[PDB]
Ligand binder design. Structure first.
Ligand code: NA
Length: 253
């Protein structure tokens, strides 16, 4: 019934915690390999994965309400589990919920010290809804290098969850763009790391656009993973665990 799951370390002995939001259509399972690397690459950091219930909602307003509910539930469970300094991690579309979680942690005066986002850039314009067909999505994801299920059952579940996560992230970022249009989005004094595979085709012009994360927090740091595409949790999970360890090192004081 908890919104989070302990995947590595032990909060009774750790020096910090990282709470992790999965890529589109993903969940804690997508972090298994990364978690297995944490004791070696990030010894002092315990790791929680966020469960994505994909609560049914009937409007953009209800989706935003759901983002708030889910982020609040994650903060509830995290702070109930640990007082340790916290790093928030997200891959790709999970960035939306990660931002919400980070902002709520800041609102609660929790000891949140960094935001680390893989394979995503800040959105500064109202987005476009996804009207592609299922075959169009699968062709696009295949070209981008995604892993895709072969069983039609798994394909249907994947496409449902992918469409849901894209809707959630579009609604949340559109909300942030609205706030920014009124000067109502406060930058938080939380450093931001943007981790990008140099061959990632979904973050165009990231060497310049990564700095847009400064609408969220500051300072902003870019780290490039040469030879890697968009799927950092699949193709260099040890490197991302190490990235979390490095963040902790940077914010440990
Ligand atoms: Na990935």
């Amino acid at each position: 019934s908890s919104s989070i799951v302990l995947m590595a370390g032990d909060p009774a002995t750790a020096k910090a915690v990282v709470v992790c939001v999965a890529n589109a259509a993903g969940g804690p399972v997508n972090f298994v390999d990364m978690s297995r690397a944490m004791p070696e690459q990030a010894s002092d950091v315990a790791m929680f994965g966020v469960k994505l219930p994909r609560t049914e909602v009937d409007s953009d307003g209800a989706m935003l309400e759901e983002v708030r509910r889910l982020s609040n539930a994650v903060c509830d469970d995290l702070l109930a589990a640990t007082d340790l300094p916290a790093i928030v991690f997200a891959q790709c579309n999970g960035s939306a919920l990660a931002l919400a979680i980070t902002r709520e942690l800041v609102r609660r005066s929790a000891d949140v010290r960094a935001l680390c986002i893989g394979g995503a850039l800040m959105r500064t314009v109202t987005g476009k809804r996804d009207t592609r067909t299922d075959d169009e999505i699968l062709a696009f994801l295949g070209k981008a290098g995604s892993t895709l299920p072969a069983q039609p059952d798994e394909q249907a579940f994947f496409l449902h969850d992918f469409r849901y996560d894209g809707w959630l992230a579009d609604v949340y970022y559109n909300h942030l763009v609205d706030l920014m249009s009124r000067g109502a989005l406060e930058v938080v004094d939380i450093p931001v790391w943007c981790l990008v595979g140099s061959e990632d085709p979904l973050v165009p012009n990231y060497p310049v656009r990564f700095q847009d994360w400064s609408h969220i927090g500051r300072p902003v740091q870019l780290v490039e993973y040469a030879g890697i595409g968009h799927y950092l949790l699949r193709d260099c999970p040890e490197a991302i665990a190490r990235a979390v360890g490095s963040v902790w090192e940077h914010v440990s004081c």
